[PDB]
Amino acid sequence: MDKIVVQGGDNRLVGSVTIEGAKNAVLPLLAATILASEGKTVLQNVPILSDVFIMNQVVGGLNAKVDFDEEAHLVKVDATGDITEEAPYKYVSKMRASIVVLGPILARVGHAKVSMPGGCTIGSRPIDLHLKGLEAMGVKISQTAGYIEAKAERLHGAHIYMDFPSVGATQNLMMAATLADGVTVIENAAREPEIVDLAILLNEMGAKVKGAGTETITITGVEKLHGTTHNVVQDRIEAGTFMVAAAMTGGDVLIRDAVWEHNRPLIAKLLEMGVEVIEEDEGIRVRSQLENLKAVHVKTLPHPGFPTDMQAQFTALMTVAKGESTMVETVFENRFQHLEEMRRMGLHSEIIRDTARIVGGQPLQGAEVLSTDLRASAALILTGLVAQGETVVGKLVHLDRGYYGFHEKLAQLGAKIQRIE
Amino acid sequence: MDKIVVQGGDNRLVGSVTIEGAKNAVLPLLAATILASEGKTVLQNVPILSDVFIMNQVVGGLNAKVDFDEEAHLVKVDATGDITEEAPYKYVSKMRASIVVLGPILARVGHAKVSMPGGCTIGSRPIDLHLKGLEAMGVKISQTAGYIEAKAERLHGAHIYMDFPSVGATQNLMMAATLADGVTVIENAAREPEIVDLAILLNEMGAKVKGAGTETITITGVEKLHGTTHNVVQDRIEAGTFMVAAAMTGGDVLIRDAVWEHNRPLIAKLLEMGVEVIEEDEGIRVRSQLENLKAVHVKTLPHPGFPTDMQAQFTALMTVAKGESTMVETVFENRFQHLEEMRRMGLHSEIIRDTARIVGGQPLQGAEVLSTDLRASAALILTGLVAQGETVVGKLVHLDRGYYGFHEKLAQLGAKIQRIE
Ligand SMILES: *[C@](C)(OP(=O)(O)O)C(=O)O
Ligand SMILES: *[C@](C)(OP(=O)(O)O)C(=O)O
Ligand SMILES: [Cl-]
Ligand SMILES: [Cl-]
């Protein structure tokens, strides 16, 4: 379909950029609207992304009324009617994150039918942590012709120790627990900012959720939740993507209203590399002198460690620094596909299992490249800014799941970039 | 788009099956036709596959005349004219194996322009072994706007120790060596049957290639090669796929004219599992009693070890054996994607890095599933034969690269299977 075309070199980025609401918070926040049996829920700062339109179809398919005012970045949900139980294959097959309606359907309805997710290109993503935790809460799981068929005669709390701090499983279990009998304790919980924002929404709806952001979340079940109005937290991955873009072009960019505390492990590694990062009244400013950039080691880890969703973009910055950088991806088994396409731009990298070694300063050239996944697409476009000549990036269906107007925002900062239909 | 629909649970396969010429031999054999400056080359037993049509476009684009008589399974090549140098992005981006014209173009023309391959879904596949070996032969490598630019002022032999026995790099280097000055020795060479068949063709064309099938290939360069007529070796992966299908359905199938020596590590593991494998005058017969199948351990390795191109299909057979089987995939890093789609059919598997553990005897159900790659597609269809209910397999573009008439061959053995347009 469309292509993004970048004229390489001389793309120093200068100016200010507005960041959308978080893709990875709005999807579970929309799932949470099913819990409210009284009042309507309004989410503000909603990003206009393909994944949001799909989740609105999933929630609407449960007999909730979903209205998306795109100009106002607002979604209104009326879940006060009789909620139904099915999340069909036609939606789950297009977006794995659809799975986070399982918990709220079980809490509100007591039974659910959710298509089992299949393979994902960036790694094996089994949902046993979701299903094991729900079984501990009294849910009987069957699987029939591709569907998870879940029944809770009397959903109840459980003391769950997570083998891994799964973001999606933590969200599913927290939401199921809000209307379960008694207390649920999730040990080794995901600590990501999106977990915190979901807990804020649930507490605004009349739930009793404590500890979000720590390794232990405690939920005290209640009889019913109420709708509320809530601003989606800023997208820290879109914010971090523009911080990386500023750093690798020797730019000076103000990322408007960026949250320092969400951006911590990225900001610390940018400061270690020699990038300047300044907290100002209107946002976080990122500036760099290209000759000051030094190679670093990064290891992706569950929050508060370095976020896997920033890894591909950070490897693009490692290409311009001085020395050999090392990126260790521990969260996803197969998230270095962008480094394979970057070979076409002249980038040599050494990949052994979960570790990529990248010598900075190689003389890259623009080439025709194809996106394999959302963050890989952004990493290819960022590398196109610094390569010599013209880069053409295709398979933009991936970029459109998580960035709104990426080429327009880069062009207003001074990049020679166009999106051609 | 097209779908394969399987009615499962009762699909004992009985009868005889014809196997096509090898997709992994015909592609390098077609590249080798560029070496012949006198006489035309005729390949017989050519399979009707999408990859063959692309390779015919690559070779035709070098100013060789390529005629494919599909009814006769015959390709005729006239490379006696002035051969050109470019293998463009529009072909390499659709088929990585296009890269094996680099060696023969350098041998025949002395310069080449070949699009650099990018990412592949089943694993990182860098071509450094190809380029390092060509540099040792006097080729100067540049990279410009996505293309490998290669020039050999006077191509010559080299004593190359391969870091890994790469099939494609071994093919590229042995073809380049045929017209180089002096002797080339490839240590730690690929030993696969497709290497042996390519060496047979080169020797029939007047080359001096010795040692194919062993860890050391020696090539003595000559001035020019001549066209010849050659039967493509039988596809041992299609043959092995029907051996696995017979075993997992408790069938009795004669795989016509199968070559025992090419099928060795697969046959030995089938015998260890309890399958009966009988060498007969018309082919290799595979029979099994389902209650006799026992779990086994398999590790993929370079030939003569167990072939990675049989791994996915063999994991489908592991689902019906008694006990816990283990599959270690050492050749590719991302080749367990079919096991994630198989969770939709009810299959639980434990995947840690390169190792998959599969408990046999789980009660699988048919579901709608999507192919991720060629051998994964075959593995999903085979699992559909034994699951209870209807399996629908999509994304058949992958299957069509390596199997001709797969659903028709299974239906004539008794499978309840249809390909719907
Ligand atoms: C991965 C990216 O999951 P999703 O697309 O989000 O369902 C995939 O399917 O490749
Ligand atoms: C792998 C399968 O290589 P190819 O398709 O053969 O070029 C890929 O590109 O996914
Ligand atoms: Cl389904
Ligand atoms: Cl021979």
User: Domains of chain B: which residue ranges?
Assistant: 1-19+234-421, 22-232
Distances (CA, A) of A8 to A205, A220, A349, A391, B149: 49, 55, 21, 7, 21
Q: Is the CB of B96 under 6 A from ligand 2?
A: yes
- The residue with tokens 């990493």 is A379
Ligand found nearest the CA of B208: 4
CA B409 – CA A56 distance, rounded (Å): 44
Q: DSSP letters of B201-259?
A: HHHHTT--EE-BTBSEEEEE--S-EE--EEEPPB-HHHHHHHHHHHHHTT-EEEEET--
Helix B102-109 vs helix B128-136: angle between axes, to the nearest 10 degrees? 20
Q: DSSP letters of A342-372?
A: HGGGT--EEEETTEEEEETT---B--EEE--
Omega before B126 cis (within 30°)?
Answer: no
**Breaks (C–N over 2.5 Å) after residues, chain B:** none
Distances (CA, A) of B339 to B28, B316, B369: 31, 9, 11
B370 part of contact set with chain A, CB < 8 Å? yes
Cβ-contact B286, B251 below 8 angstroms: yes
Q: For strands A229-231 and A41-44, give the pairing.
A: parallel
Topology of the domain covering A1-19+234-421:
UDP-n-acetylglucosamine1-carboxyvinyl-transferase; Chain (3.65.10)
Q: Is the CB of B121 under 6 A from ligand 2?
A: yes
A203 part of contact set with chain B, CB < 8 Å? no
Put simply, the answer to whether A146 touches B370 (Cβ < 8 Å) is: no
| B120 in catalytic set | yes
Domain A1-19+234-421 shares a fold with domain A22-232: yes
Pocket residues for ligand 1 (CB within 6 Å)?
A: A 95-96, 120-122, 373
CA B61 – CA B87 distance, rounded (Å): 7
Ligand found nearest the CA of B207: 4
**Torsion angle (degrees, nearest 10) of CA B231, B236, B238, B242:** 130
Residue A409 in tokens: 């925002």
Q: What is the resolution of this structure in A?
A: 1.3
Q: Is the CB of B95 under 6 A from ligand 2?
A: yes
Residue B274 in tokens: 């309890």
Does the annotation flag A129 for ligand binding?
yes
Closest CA to B399 of B366, B420, B370, B367: B370
Cβ-Cβ contacts under 8 Å for A310 (sequence gap 6 or more) = A237, A240, A241, A244, A266, A375
CB-based burial, A168-198: b 16+ in 10 Å, e otherwise: bbbbbbbbbbbbbeeebbbebbbbbbbbbbb
Distances (CA, A) of B316 to A216, B297, B299, B360: 40, 14, 15, 10
CA B159 – CA B36 distance, rounded (Å): 25
Rounded to 5 degrees, φ, ψ at A5 are -115, 125
Residue B320 in tokens: 């019906």
Rounded to 5 degrees, φ, ψ at B47 are -80, 150
B118 part of contact set with chain A, CB < 8 Å? yes
Put simply, the answer to whether B353 touches A351 (Cβ < 8 Å) is: no
First to last CA, chain A: 7
> Looking at A101-189, which runs of residues are DSSP E strands?
111-115, 139-144, 147-152, 159-161, 183-187
Helix B236-248 vs helix B264-273: angle between axes, to the nearest 10 degrees? 10
Cβ-Cβ contacts under 8 Å for A410 (sequence gap 6 or more) = A13, A245, A381, A385, A417
CATH ID of B22-232, from 3.40.190.10, 3.50.50.60, 3.65.10.10, 3.10.130.10: 3.65.10.10
Q: Is A209 helix (H, G, I), strand (E, B) or coil?
A: strand
Where do runs of H (alpha helix) occur along A39-160? Answer: 50-60, 89-92, 102-109, 128-136
Task: Suggest the residue from B163, B340, B342, B352 to mutate for an interface test with chain A (most A CBs closer than 10 A).
Answer: B340
Query: Which residue in chain A is spatially nearest to B332 when comparing CA positions?
Result: A353
Which of A93, A95, A121 maximizes ligand 1 atoms within 8 Å of its Cβ, making it the mutation to test the pocket?
A121
